[PDB]
Amino acid sequence: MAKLTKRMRVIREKVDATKQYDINEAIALLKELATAKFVESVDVAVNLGIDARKSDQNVRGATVLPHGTGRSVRVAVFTQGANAEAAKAAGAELVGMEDLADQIKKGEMNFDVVIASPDAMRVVGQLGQVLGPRGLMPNPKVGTVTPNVAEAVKNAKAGQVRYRNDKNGIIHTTIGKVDFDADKLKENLEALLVALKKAKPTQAKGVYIKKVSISTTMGAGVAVDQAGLSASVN
Amino acid sequence: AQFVYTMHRVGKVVPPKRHILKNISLSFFPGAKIGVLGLNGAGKSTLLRIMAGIDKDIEGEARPQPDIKIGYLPQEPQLNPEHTVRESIEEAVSEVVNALKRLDEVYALYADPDADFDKLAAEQGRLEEIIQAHDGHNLNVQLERAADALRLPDWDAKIANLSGGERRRVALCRLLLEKPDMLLLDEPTNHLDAESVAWLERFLHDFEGTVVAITHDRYFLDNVAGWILELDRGEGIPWEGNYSSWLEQKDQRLAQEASQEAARRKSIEKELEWVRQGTKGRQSKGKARLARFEELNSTEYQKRNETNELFIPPGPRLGDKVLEVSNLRKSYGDRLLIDDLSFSIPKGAIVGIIGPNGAGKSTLFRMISGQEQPDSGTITLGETVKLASVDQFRDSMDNSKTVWEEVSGGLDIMKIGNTEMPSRAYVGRFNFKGVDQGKRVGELSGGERGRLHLAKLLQVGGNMLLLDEPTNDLDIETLRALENALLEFPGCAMVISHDRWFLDRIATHILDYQDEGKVEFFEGNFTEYEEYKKRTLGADALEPKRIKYKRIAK
Amino acid sequence: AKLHDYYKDEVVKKLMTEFNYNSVMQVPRVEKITLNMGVGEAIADKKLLDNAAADLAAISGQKPLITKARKSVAGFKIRQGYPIGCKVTLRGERMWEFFERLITIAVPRIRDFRGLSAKSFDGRGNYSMGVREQIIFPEIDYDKVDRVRGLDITITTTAKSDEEGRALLAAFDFPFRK
Amino acid sequence: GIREKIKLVSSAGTGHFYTTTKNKRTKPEKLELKKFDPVVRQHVIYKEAK
Amino acid sequence: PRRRVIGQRKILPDPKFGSELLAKFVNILMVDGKKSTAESIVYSALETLAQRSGKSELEAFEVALENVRPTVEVKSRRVGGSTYQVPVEVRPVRRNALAMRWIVEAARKRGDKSMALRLANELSDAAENKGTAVKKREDVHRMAEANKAFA
RNA sequence: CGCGGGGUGGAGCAGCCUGGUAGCUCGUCGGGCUCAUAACCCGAAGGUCGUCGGUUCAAAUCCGGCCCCCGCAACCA
RNA sequence: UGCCCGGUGCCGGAAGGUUAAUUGAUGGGGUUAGCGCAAGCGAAGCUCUUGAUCGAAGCCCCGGUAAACGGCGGAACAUUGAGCCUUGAUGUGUAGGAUAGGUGGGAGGCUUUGAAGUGUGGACGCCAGUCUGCAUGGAGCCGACCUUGAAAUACCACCCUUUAAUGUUUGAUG
RNA sequence: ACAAUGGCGCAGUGCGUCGUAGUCCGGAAGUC
């Protein structure tokens, strides 16, 4: 793959390149180092100690964070039959009976959260092995298919985040936008950190954070010293 | 940590033979590419059977790193006779496929009116942790296409019809999807064709976390090949590098050592000889005579197996036309093996047979031996021609039988071809002294199980040899022995090889299995075929195709 | 099949009234007949005996008993318990069966034979003889056997004299045809 | 010489072994017999060898 | 003779095509003094090659003539009380004389049922460069290449 | 008397602690190269392993029992 | 005033083999915040043990020596490894030529020129591609790609490996 | 003599046979 291009080098030479700062300081830097592309979304790339090769820690799943993530909380449901029969009252956002994720190579990205069902997943989504070159197609790897579609949709609309570890222990997660209040951002950050403490490493050394890297859709990123239990965000 | 594997004072005592491994203390680190070398009986396959954990009846501590997955590839794989797809799916993705099938049942259950949603959602969590922990799976087209790119026989083919390299290449490709991090493997160079050896070289060379094998090829030792673990008195001596001049140095290190030990012993005997005349006896008569002789003066054992060598029975007298094939055609399903093949073999002729594993070489042998028939064309043998066949498949009745008994069949006197001789003396001409004869087939090295195999099938008389992969199981001193024996045999033989010198010995003619139904016959030494090949190459140079790039470089 | 009956009635009364006995149990009845081959097959070749075995088992309907050497011989190397040949003891049915086949067909086909030979007696009353070429039997041919052997025979009978055995032999039917 | 000393381990009873000798010169095979277990108080297959 | 040495003496033409390369070719192949039994199996060898292969009869001995033709050879030259093997370049006259001989010697040595058969084998393996005749030449090559040092 | 080594074809030796094949040099024999003789070339022959028997399935080998040749010692007085 | 360096003594050499103190890495064991009616699992810190890494003289080995003992037959600096970053470059086990590690962000740009094309030097036999110097050009390549595949490559984090450069830290020799 | 430049049969030649074998070879030996 292509690596660290001229555009990223030069943007980084204007404000800042490869260092850790306090959460208030980092985010301020990131916000103004943004270029455009499109109005600034923040995501966080969390390096922790993994026992994930042997699934002895839960760091591939998805949990609701107290504020609704991304810029629009965008939900699509691949489902069929007697599972979304019982989502009649609640309502799935979008039903794909087979075909609903296919917009990507036409220059079109679109979901915060893809909900999938047990009848659907065997058809569509069951090869989770490769999705390349991005991980958006619905997969076994973040897991937990629907017992009924109803509850799954309610959770996603409320503010559910799909996170995996990469390969070697970096857990990439959408926190929100930069327009969100320091206090509204703080909460999601704190929430992802307790989510990991619950799910501890069992013998990857006791580390729930190591190196925090932080990013937005276009600019250049920076790293945090600590983002969760320190004070404020802005 | 640096220790990917570590060994503390490891040994093995075999009181019939000698001590076969002793005081092995080594540390294996990331990035290292190690070939373990030595003769038959040097303990090199055993050292790898210890590190793989196969053999654990040892002194000392043989200990792996706690987070590595460790891959081991033996010389005769555990793949059952079952089909190619079924054995390829079996020990690799099964654990993930069972998790993906339970995960589909859980999908089906979400649409069932009586399923427990809370226990379904916990089973889904423990399934997705398995499928992610394993990571890979059977997949839509991957492994299946990868096996076809790496040119393995049919996905619906039987593992039991598959020859040395193919069956090993499947086993390896599988093994690698199962456990990657450290490789421990049992002479992987023998019985694997040109494109498969160039593949194995590339893979081992790029490898992570490390590689530990064995080889008998000078090309391996130059390309992969970072470190050399010499085994020979049962001690291990790691040496960093190198090239074929080290082998020459080793031969010179043993000739110096054997002669310096033989002089020290002789030097001691002159001093011992006078002693009677009128010493007091004192420390020499006890320390010299009782303690030094038999045990301490007995180091010369490994160097002595070099001059036991090996034997092939010569022919029954036989005429000028041995074998006549005209326009022979043979296929297996849809795969053309042989098409319009014609050759006649003259007396004193040694025919080399080349090409890939599974090209159809053994199926010719089977038509000559009448366990097959020509689909089209004809095979005519002379009338007095007697055949002696040597397979890839070298299996036998039991593993707890003696060397002598497996070869003799319970006879003191054997009729070897047209002539009677004592069996014990016949079994010894394959390098077997009375204590090596009394050992069992399960105990023996592959290289001893190789001489054992040849010693057995050669009793019917050496009139017409059909040898498939001779080099297979052999250690290098047994390889020198087969070569020396073959330099003294008269010929009437059709023989396979993959090994350049061995090819150079076995041609006075060539059958080159090139492609489906293309098998070429040429009459001459391998050097003659080589000059012909360089002439074809010449003309190939000017022609624009990216075929010729492989004959130029890798 | 055949000889069995010819023995009960005709043969038995003929012997009875030549020795003028009054008990019909004082008449010789054939007791057994042994088919030994022991031409050293298993001294230089274990499977040649297996062969040899099978060849006696073709004329008798069933596998044979593998024979063994009873002490150490230096001049032939062997030892006690060492295989060396094979027998088939015949009593009853198989006795009859063989006996028939033999006299009828085989005995004409013996080299230059044309009469009677009844001079070989143990002392008790028992008869033996050899077989040089095995192919003299109606079901053993050269276009059937892989290579030719001989074998030898031991006819035991409840005779108490060689007058007795000698008569028994002459009272059987040698027809000189195939 | 000395016919070797094995220590025959138990696997439904005791955690120990009974003690005996065997000829390894002619048996590369691992020994097993029924020997009596005082912990189970019943006879049982004993296994394991040198 | 050392004074009255002379070159080839008037070979009798090819009956069929008229080439005096073919004339020589036949000559060489004969034994016990019979051109008839020679030339008989020669035409038979040509026909079987031009048949199998499909080639003209012409190029079936002319591009066999090129690939069996040598370019250097090995002379065991005693030079006093000492002896050294040396190469020299084979004399043009001799150079394809040698060629045609060897194609007959190759088939005599290299087996098959009959001499026309054995020769319709070598006439292939000539022009392809692997033949028993090809070998001879790919042998006096190696052996003038090591001794290339001396001369 | 007391200790121990070695007896292998015609000569001089290997093998022998590992019992299943007797190997080497010279000479001899037969064939060649010389006019002839040495050298030289090709091929072959000659051995109960000093013996007698023993354990062993089997001894040149391991173990004993005789016939030999050579060494070591014969001392405190 | 000759012959012997195999022995014993010694001298000269260390490339390899074996090798001390040193150093204390890894594995193993003990304790128990805590998880659990629960059996039994066990973090951190502290210890009990094993002894990676380095490591010489000696010794094996290599070369000598008998007017040796004796024997003389049948603080700086240069070079150079390695631990961390920092800054780059391939990321090819099946198609797909391949630059599809993998996940989130995410559909339009400044990188004031960043076009791009034509050509030069190096890099990958993935040499289609891009990486990467310099001239013309102060200008937007590129995303149904072209193509296969269940998935297609805009564009920002960033993952570790094979590896490189700077910052170094450290261990060596000189 | 040892053989298909041939053997046998009706030097050479015409047919027909044998197909490389100790053979229809040679008159056991012998594969030039």
Side-chain angles (χ1 to χ4, degrees), chain A residues 50-55 165 167-168, chain B residues 69 129 132-134:
Chain A
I50 60 165
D51 285 313
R53 297 189 167 97
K54 64 183 188 287
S55 295
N165 66 288
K167 173 182 51 169
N168 290 302
Chain B
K69 288 290 188 303
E129 292 163 359
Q132 205 67 85
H134 201 86

Side-chain angles (χ1 to χ4, degrees), chain B residues 169 256 320 353 479-480 534:
Chain B
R169 182 149 99 276
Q256 181 174 355
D320 287 297
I353 323 160
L479 281 163
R480 292 195 278 265
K534 272 162 175 179

Side-chain angles (χ1 to χ4, degrees), chain A residues 131-203:
Chain A
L131 312 172
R134 45 184 84 100
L136 286 48
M137 281 199 310
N139 59 75
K141 289 185 174 186
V142 296
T144 311
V145 290
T146 55
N148 279 288
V149 169
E151 296 317 296
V153 177
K154 298 176 289 178
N155 295 331
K157 287 188 160 171
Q160 184 161 309
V161 203
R162 89 307 182 184
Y163 58 73
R164 202 182 90 157
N165 66 288
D166 73 316
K167 173 182 51 169
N168 290 302
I170 189 156
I171 311 183
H172 313 91
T173 285
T174 324
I175 304 292
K177 190 82 188 309
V178 185
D179 295 75
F180 297 177
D181 306 359
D183 289 89
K184 181 168 194 168
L185 283 167
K186 186 88 287 190
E187 215 56 45
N188 291 0
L189 303 172
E190 192 176 338
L192 164 80
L193 190 53
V194 291
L196 312 176
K197 295 274 170 68
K198 289 166 59 67
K200 65 175 308 173
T202 49
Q203 57 213 77

Side-chain angles (χ1 to χ4, degrees), chain B residues 362-408:
Chain B
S362 100
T363 71
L364 174 57
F365 286 169
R366 280 178 261 190
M367 296 176 286
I368 286 166
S369 58
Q371 305 171 80
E372 269 290 8
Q373 202 185 112
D375 290 337
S376 180
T378 49
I379 292 192
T380 305
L381 270 300
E383 279 305 287
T384 58
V385 187
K386 301 176 163 64
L387 320 161
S389 312
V390 186
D391 283 291
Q392 289 299 352
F393 295 90
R394 290 184 173 169
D395 320 281
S396 202
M397 307 280 284
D398 188 71
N399 59 328
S400 294
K401 189 170 180 82
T402 62
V403 168
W404 188 56
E405 215 190 281
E406 168 71 302
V407 176
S408 66

Side-chain angles (χ1 to χ4, degrees), chain B residues 321 522 528 531-532 535, chain E residues 113 129-130 135 137:
Chain B
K321 296 297 138 285
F522 133 108
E528 312 140 53
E531 299 320 97
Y532 162 1
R535 293 160 168 165
Chain E
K113 297 294 153 189
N129 304 272
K130 38 185 205 236
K135 180 183 179 54
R137 192 177 59 71

Side-chain angles (χ1 to χ4, degrees), chain B residues 409-415 420 459, chain C residues 42-47 77 79 82:
Chain B
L411 301 175
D412 294 94
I413 313 165
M414 289 178 93
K415 187 69 161 166
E420 306 61 350
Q459 69 191 282
Chain C
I43 64 117
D45 198 48
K46 220 70 164 184
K47 57 179 209 295
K77 316 206 53 173
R79 73 201 73 122
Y82 198 75

Side-chain angles (χ1 to χ4, degrees), chain B residues 5 46-55 70-73 184:
Chain B
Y5 217 108
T46 305
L47 170 104
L48 292 178
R49 282 196 290 262
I50 291 171
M51 289 184 65
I54 298 179
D55 208 302
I70 321 178
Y72 182 83
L73 179 88
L184 300 177

